[PDB]
Amino acid sequence: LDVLKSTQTVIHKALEKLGYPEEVYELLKEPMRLLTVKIPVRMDDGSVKIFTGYRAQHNDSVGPTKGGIRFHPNVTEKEVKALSIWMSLKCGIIDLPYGGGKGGIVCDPRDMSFRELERLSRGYVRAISQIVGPTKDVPAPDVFTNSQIMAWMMDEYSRIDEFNSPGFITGKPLVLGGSHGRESATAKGVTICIKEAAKKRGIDIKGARVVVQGFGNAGSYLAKFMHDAGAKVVGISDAYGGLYDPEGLDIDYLLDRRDSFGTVTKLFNDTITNQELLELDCDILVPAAIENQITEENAHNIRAKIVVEAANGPTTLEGTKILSDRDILLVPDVLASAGGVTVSYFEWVQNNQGFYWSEEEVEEKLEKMMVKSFNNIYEMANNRRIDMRLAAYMVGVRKMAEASRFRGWI
Amino acid sequence: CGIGLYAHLKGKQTHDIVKQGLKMLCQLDHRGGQGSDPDTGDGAGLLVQIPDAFFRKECKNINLPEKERYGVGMVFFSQKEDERKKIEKQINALIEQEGQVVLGWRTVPVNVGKIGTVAQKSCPFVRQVFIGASSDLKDNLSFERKLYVIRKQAENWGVTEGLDFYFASLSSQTIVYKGLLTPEQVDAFYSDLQDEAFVSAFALVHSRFSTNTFPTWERAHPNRYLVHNGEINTLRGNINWMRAREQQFVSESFGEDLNKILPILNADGSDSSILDNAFEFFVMAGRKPAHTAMMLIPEPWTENTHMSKEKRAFYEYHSSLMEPWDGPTAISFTDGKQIGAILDRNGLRPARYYVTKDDYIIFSSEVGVIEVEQENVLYKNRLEPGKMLLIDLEEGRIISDEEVKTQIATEYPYQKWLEEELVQVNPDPESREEEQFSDLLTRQKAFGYTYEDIQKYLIPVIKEGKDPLGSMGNDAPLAVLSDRAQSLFNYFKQLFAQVTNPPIDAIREQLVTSTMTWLGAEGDLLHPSERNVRRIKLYTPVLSNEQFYALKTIVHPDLKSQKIDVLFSEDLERGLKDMFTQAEKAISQGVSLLILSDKKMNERLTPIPPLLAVSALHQHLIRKGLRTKVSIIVESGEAREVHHFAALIGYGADAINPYLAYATYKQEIDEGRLDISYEEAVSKYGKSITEGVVKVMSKMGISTVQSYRGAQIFEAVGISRDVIDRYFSGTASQLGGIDLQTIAEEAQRRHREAYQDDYSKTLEPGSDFQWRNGGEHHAFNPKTIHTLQWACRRNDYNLFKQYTKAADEERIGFLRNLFAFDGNRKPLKLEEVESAESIVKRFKTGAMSFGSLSKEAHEALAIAMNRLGGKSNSGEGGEDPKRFVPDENGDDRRSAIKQIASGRFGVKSHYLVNADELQIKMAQGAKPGEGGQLPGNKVYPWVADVRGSTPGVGLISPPPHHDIYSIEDLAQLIHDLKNANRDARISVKLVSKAGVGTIAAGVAKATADVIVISGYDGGTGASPKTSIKHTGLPWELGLAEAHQTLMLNGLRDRVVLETDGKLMTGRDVVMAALLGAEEFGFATAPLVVLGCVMMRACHLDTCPVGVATQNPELRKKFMGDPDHIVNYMLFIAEEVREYMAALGFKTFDEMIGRTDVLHVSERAKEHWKASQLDLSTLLYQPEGVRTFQSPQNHKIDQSLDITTILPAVQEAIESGKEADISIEINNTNRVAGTITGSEISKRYGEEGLPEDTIKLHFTGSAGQSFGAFVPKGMTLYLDGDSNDYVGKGLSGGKIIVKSSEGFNSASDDNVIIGNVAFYGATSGEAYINGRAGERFAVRNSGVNVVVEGIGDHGCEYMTGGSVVVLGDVGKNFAAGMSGGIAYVLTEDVKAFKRKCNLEMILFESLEDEKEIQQIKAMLERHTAYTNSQKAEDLLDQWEDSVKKFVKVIPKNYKQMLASIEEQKAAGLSDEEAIMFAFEANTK
């Protein structure tokens, strides 16, 4: 209900800290292009259903907008605008030549079918075809979207434009112009941030104790990366509980027994709950799981020197304040989870060139980009006695404000 | 019974190998049982190589080409000749069409006069046909494929034409001679074997048991390729999966021959035959025999950390295309040039082999099978679980299992394929939506939820992490008999493993189980590559809402999903057919997931019963060859119980989503209760449900959900056979029952009332495990309880009559209540019938453990039974020796019947001898396939002393009898018990189920004096509610089946039949007698007489009447008296007398078996669903004897103890003087000492005799159960080796086993002892000079042993004593260790710890001087009695040996001992110190 207001508040605070006037905030608080469309879709039963779609473009001064499309019944204009602004912030943090964009459709994919989903995706692409393209707006997947939906959208756009346009949409399969590293991008970015934070704090990664809350794809890849780097993972968690071993957890065996959903717990063995998993003795803590897990009660009980928010908003304002008081280095999600956006940008670059890179090239480029962003944010937060979250917000808004001023919009 | 093989490694062919093979068969014949007559061949067979020289010599007309270019057939034909020549002509035509040449035919000479009457009558005509290979076939594999195709075509043509001919063997390298012949009769029947021209590099042999007395020549094996010893419990699922995959099979090797060989498996064949057919088909498909064996019976990879990465990848890959063939199996296969032997995953069968210096291998179940030279023996080993014994004749060497497995695993990149092709379903984290409906109450009412159901099944599951317990098993009527509408789930009852296969302990053997499930479409099984593992895999079939949504929204074109709403309005058949059409359309479109949903249902549309829908869809897809291309997800509100989930999985469901249960949990959380969060509640519910399903599988012994899914381990009660065949094919329904219209009517009724329900916003209270006014009827209602108590306390008769009337009439509770007497006879007077004093002698009080009950109730029941002349049963908790002496007042507390369970807690020589009947509890009604668990807080000192355990230490009773892995093992145990007490009756207690009649026939063959049938309504002190309610069948069906089968097989006169389970009235007793029961059991009613009010709180140790609790405060409230039990029994007997007088029967034997007196009552016909039952199955009287007459002559005479030991030991025992003697022993001498031990115990008792008084030396190989129940004073020496069950139930004494003096190889490397040793042992010591097998010291309770290595599952359920292992240890060591101490010597402490189970043990080092001295003395005695080089070296290097030793001790055991020692030091007496420590540790 207040997501847009909160985003506006953080934008205002960042602009005030940077010293920009109020006209910049007036321009950047709301997107300058919001489109609402009605999509008629023929269903399997033969009836026709009218779906509602939204597409918001926060800014285009830096470059073409970059956004995602989510198929949820609770989508709203306010949510779409707020997430477009957040995407702009992420792009500015990573220093991409992108703006912020966000798409949404009011639907229930659980009740929808394969052919109905294809028809809905095509209809949405048609409705927004007038303001999107490889040079205007680049969509990607979000909740209840995947490579098949991206491929359907790409086919729709090519069928409209009379020529193939792989760069119009990212998140595609490899055969259609996808990029390697699309699955381990977030985990690799989190690993890079963890390594940089450890270097800054003097903690040696060799033998460092890491706890990961969440063993999905991101959690599994992150645990594998720490194990390869030499850090010891002393705790993991899944939907059924967690495990604890100060001397190591045998990540190889855990991954071998890992199923599709990421379950690794045994049946007749007691498990460790997340509440006391977060309180374990470790140097690095990584919540990549459900949000609102760190609060006042557990902030003092947390024993981690570094906390990295792999998931979205796993920490509250009070928890951040307490961690800052306790001198615990917090890595915000807006920075940690930018690996997916970076890999989508690499896919866009590959589509533009016609040349597709390899896993090693993607790895090294992502490493350099994330390291530069992390170092810039850390230097900003050291020069100004503020938090990394505020520093990241300022870095995100600076590029957009400067581009708008240069182009003369304000 | 058993298997064997005598072979030469290098391939040298002789006739002595065949002669030795028949000798092994003759030796193994003793294992099998005795049928109607001994001369009839129970079943035997011999497989050998092709005898080219003999064929050339004996043909003289057929031009036989060189070895591998011609094949030999072997056919059993009917005596009729016209059809014989018809089939011969057809076979020749098929051969000519295939292009191979018909060399000719031959007739095998047969000596019919040497065979028994039945086998003489059934003897077929034996004719062989010779096939010559065409020049085109360069390789022998193509020729073998052509012969296989010819044989399959001939068999298909024969079954189509209805002709009865069998192809015993048709190969270019193997020939089989088999039939209903004894080992001695085989050679006589086949005069060819006598000829010296018979030469073969190997000879495999098998002898059967034939549970039934009507075997067939075809069913005998060796089969075409392999011999199988044991049973298969996943046969239905294996058959269904194979027949589904056969349609999709595509092979280049066979080309278009797949259409000819489409059936693959024979529907009417046995488990072994079906397994052999699958093996041979896969071998010809292009798979090596070892690879095929590994794929069919894979090792346990899930939950097993002792397996290498390559092997784990291989087995995980092959689990995606072939389900395991679970069960106890020992398999020995051969292809002419290669021979292989393997065991099941759990290794539940014995297999020992010798390798000699002359390149000869002798492998068999037993070890003392043939005479061998010790100086010639090289290796004495055994077939370890997960290890393949492979021999290649051409290469002339034994190929190591490690080498074979490594090559097979590394031949492909299985690990890389699994890593790459796996698909992830990582759900979005911000898509969370806690689902609620706002019509939750309406849906709950529609699906049958109740306040009791919630508060007593869902909340306890979250709280405790396990299925809630219960007591006083189901007294309510069946679903078919209940007036109230019932779910289709309640019509299906879980089955269990009683005999021919044991159950397993999933918790203790988790390394063997696997819940892994595959979702998607299977790849090309014959030619698999990558795509076979491009599917989804789950660790738990139960799906949360988020997982379900992710699966639905995968969208992946290769992984597509379609949703089908399983709803109907009027035509259930129509609804099912639309579901079928939708499934076929989705499959054609490419969908790989089918989601059957009950959602979107309203008053007009009611949901199809999910069990019926899943079963129908599964059968349809299996028939159409499309099941393997899809997986089934269920989204139903009628899924909240372990029984529901298990039924859905077993009838086809791949995954389930209990959305309504999740919604109920969410509502409870929201309204304040159940503070735990929604996510943790969902996860806990899923884990608990999966654990319950695993327990349900363990009941039948199935260790893998993959196999359980195909297998149908449920039996319907009240479902029409037509409906069963249409949708539940393979399921058993003895009485048929309701139809699809009735099922739809019930569902519609429940839905309609739930959706209308316009008065109340509350759920009606349940009546499943409690009695509520206006609820479901309960047999032990308050009215009946109080009437019975008042009648027994008055000694009044009209009150008892009122109670009997209420129990019998006014409701339909049991099947027997549907029967009415004819009423047209000649009534007599009450004075012309036998007296109640004689009648009561057939009654019993039923087994009830001392721990479960109180001392007062147990002694009261025993006193009442002894006074009345009946028999009382002591449970599995042992007995107090002081009760064996009658009190001065004349009351006797002794229990006539002594029970033998898997725990073997109080089992001892004294305990066994001080009895008249020894019962073997194969299963009980409430918890048939389960074991038990007694927590330390419940293990009071007055119970621990009786059970020979430490107070405050938990006790675990394993589900299976580790001795009883099959009917032969049951016979062996019966023989051991008879040796222990020759003056006692051996009883076997089973639970009613399908096939129980055949099992009873097998038991009678195994020579059990008494057979007891228990209904599923029987009581218990503690058991899961799902097991109580949904497991077992009424005793009526089982009793009728057992009676009919025994009379048909001519074994009824040899055994006494008993029944129990809700026998509350003389009418019930009369009905049981008419059904064919001579004895009757009563357990619950005596408790109610004593004061039980059916509180169903026995498991809580809070009985308000002091009946089922050990609390002294509650025991002080006990008011029961034996006089009340006496009055109850006398009233029952008077009722039986009155009924007999009315029916015109003078004696119990006269009335027994007279089912003609019964007819269906008008009430059953009036009933709207009980009128569709066919009770003619129970109303059937075959001609024969209907009462026990033959005393079941045992083989006590001719035994070694009677012939040699006793005549030279009786005087010594009587005089109390020393006596040393020596004998030569062979495998036929099984027990060898139990009779002498029993005599010693009878003469003296527990004190026995002074140590080393009687000394018995034995030279050679001993049989099963050597040194069993040997008390103090006896010392057995064994120069040689021994078989399984060494030291079983040891009650003292010494057992020493030393390797033969002529065997110079390392004893610590060579095997000397069988698998199970010292099972249930209580006291004594032993010294073993060599490695032992699996399950060493399973239930030891004080015996101290020294052994040079052991197998897997060592020290499983030990509660006392010590074990010293001077060698390696198998995996899962100390699995269930609650007491005792194990000392293991090893170099790799890390490896030893990894092998051991870490759940409930600690690792320490030898620091105590007293312990070190005790171990040193034990080793000194061992080396003195054995001359052990390892022991001598350790004693020499004692300083380093102590350092390198490892100690294992349970935490609770250590703590309790420390507390007791501290109190003793403080200066407290033993009783008070023990009590204080127990209270402190169990506060």
Ligand SMILES: Cc1cc2nc3c(=O)[nH]c(=O)nc-3n(C[C@H](O)[C@H](O)[C@H](O)COP(=O)(O)O)c2cc1C
């Ligand atoms: C409290 C209680 C404990 C029992 N314990 C055992 C037992 O330990 N072993 C066994 O085989 N049967 C046990 N039973 C079952 C009875 O001994 C008997 O076999 C039968 O199930 C009684 O049926 P009924 O309750 O309908 O009379 C127990 C029954 C009760 C009520």
Ligand code: F3S
């Ligand atoms: S049901 Fe059990 S708890 Fe007592 S009142 Fe009866 S023995």
